[PDB]
């Protein structure tokens, strides 16, 4: 029950949970481009010149 | 992702999908006019008129 002292420890192993692999996909997923505005189909002159 | 006030001085966000590159770009804003208030969105064609015109329109609409 004396509990004598011991020598100096050489190395200290650190145990830790691993990096989060297979979380990010190898291609990227962007928000798609909002489309450029279209001229709508079915546009015709509705105004006739009077008389 | 709810980016806060101090994260986005270290993040490379992108506005357009074409401006997204590989390895450099890590985020993207939702819609590209997100930088504007509710009232300054209500201004039609904001990107064509000059800036104090917009800053004056935002206090026209509130009058």
Curated annotation (Swiss-Prot), chain A:
> Which locations, inside or outside the cell, does it occupy?
Nucleus, Nucleolus; Chromosome
Q: Where is this region: Disordered?
A: 18-41
Q: Which residues carry this modification: Phosphoserine?
A: 26, 34
Pro residues: which segments have biased composition?
29-41
Other observations noted: It is in an antisense orientation to and overlaps the gene of the DNA repair enzyme ERCC1. This gene overlap is conserved in mouse, suggesting an important biological function.
Which family does the record assign?
A: Belongs to the eukaryotic RPA34 RNA polymerase subunit family.
Q: How does it assemble?
A: Component of the RNA polymerase I (Pol I) complex consisting of 13 subunits: a ten-subunit catalytic core composed of POLR1A/RPA1, POLR1B/RPA2, POLR1C/RPAC1, POLR1D/RPAC2, POLR1H/RPA12, POLR2E/RPABC1, POLR2F/RPABC2, POLR2H/RPABC3, POLR2K/RPABC4 and POLR2L/RPABC5; a mobile stalk subunit POLR1F/RPA43 protruding from the core and additional subunits homologous to general transcription factors POLR1E/RPA49 and POLR1G/RPA34. Forms a heterodimer with POLR1E/RPA49. Part of Pol I pre-initiation complex (PIC), in which Pol I core assembles with RRN3 and promoter-bound UTBF and SL1/TIF-IB complex.
Describe the function of this protein: Component of RNA polymerase I (Pol I), a DNA-dependent RNA polymerase which synthesizes ribosomal RNA precursors using the four ribonucleoside triphosphates as substrates. Involved in UBTF-activated transcription, presumably at a step following PIC formation.
Q: What is this protein called?
A: DNA-directed RNA polymerase I subunit RPA34
Classification of source organism: Eukaryota, Metazoa, Chordata, Craniata, Vertebrata
Originating gene: POLR1G
From Swiss-Prot, chain B:
Question: In which domain of life is the source organism classified?
Answer: Eukaryota
* Annotated site location: Active site gating: 56
Where does this one sit in the cell? Answer: Nucleus, Nucleolus; Chromosome
Residue ranges annotated as transmembrane are: none
Q: What does this protein do?
A: Catalytic core component of RNA polymerase I (Pol I), a DNA-dependent RNA polymerase which synthesizes ribosomal RNA precursors using the four ribonucleoside triphosphates as substrates. Transcribes 47S pre-rRNAs from multicopy rRNA gene clusters, giving rise to 5.8S, 18S and 28S ribosomal RNAs. Pol I-mediated transcription cycle proceeds through transcription initiation, transcription elongation and transcription termination stages.
Q: Which disease is it linked to?
A: Treacher Collins syndrome 4: A form of Treacher Collins syndrome, a disorder of craniofacial development. Treacher Collins syndrome is characterized by a combination of bilateral downward slanting of the palpebral fissures, colobomas of the lower eyelids with a paucity of eyelashes medial to the defect, hypoplasia of the facial bones, cleft palate, malformation of the external ears, atresia of the external auditory canals, and bilateral conductive hearing loss. TCS4 inheritance pattern is autosomal dominant.
Q: Relay the domain remarks.
A: The active site comprises the fork loops, the loops and the rudder that stabilize the transcription bubble and assist polymerase translocation.
Quaternary organization: Component of the RNA polymerase I (Pol I) complex consisting of 13 subunits: a ten-subunit catalytic core composed of POLR1A/RPA1, POLR1B/RPA2, POLR1C/RPAC1, POLR1D/RPAC2, POLR1H/RPA12, POLR2E/RPABC1, POLR2F/RPABC2, POLR2H/RPABC3, POLR2K/RPABC4 and POLR2L/RPABC5; a mobile stalk subunit POLR1F/RPA43 protruding from the core and additional subunits homologous to general transcription factors POLR1E/RPA49 and POLR1G/RPA34. Part of Pol I pre-initiation complex (PIC), in which Pol I core assembles with RRN3 and promoter-bound UTBF and SL1/TIF-IB complex.
Give the UniProt family note: Belongs to the RNA polymerase beta chain family.
- Put simply, this protein is called DNA-directed RNA polymerase I subunit RPA2
Organism listed in the record: Homo sapiens (Human)
């Amino acid at each position: 029950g004396g509990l004598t002292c011991a020598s100096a420890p050489q190395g200290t192993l650190r145990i830790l949970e691993g990096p989060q692999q297979s979380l990010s996909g190898s291609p990227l997923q962007p928000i798609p481009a909002s489309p450029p505005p279209q001229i709508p189909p079915g546009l015709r002159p509705r105004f006739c010149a009077f008389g | 992702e709810l980016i806060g006030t101090m994260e986005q001085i270290f993040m490379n966000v992108a506005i357009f999908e074409d401006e997204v590159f590989a390895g450099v770009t890590t985020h993207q804003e939702l819609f590209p006019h997100s930088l504007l208030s509710v009232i300054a969105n209500f201004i039609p064609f904001s990107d064509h008129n000059q800036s104090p015109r917009n800053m004056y329109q935002c206090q026209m609409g509130k009058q």
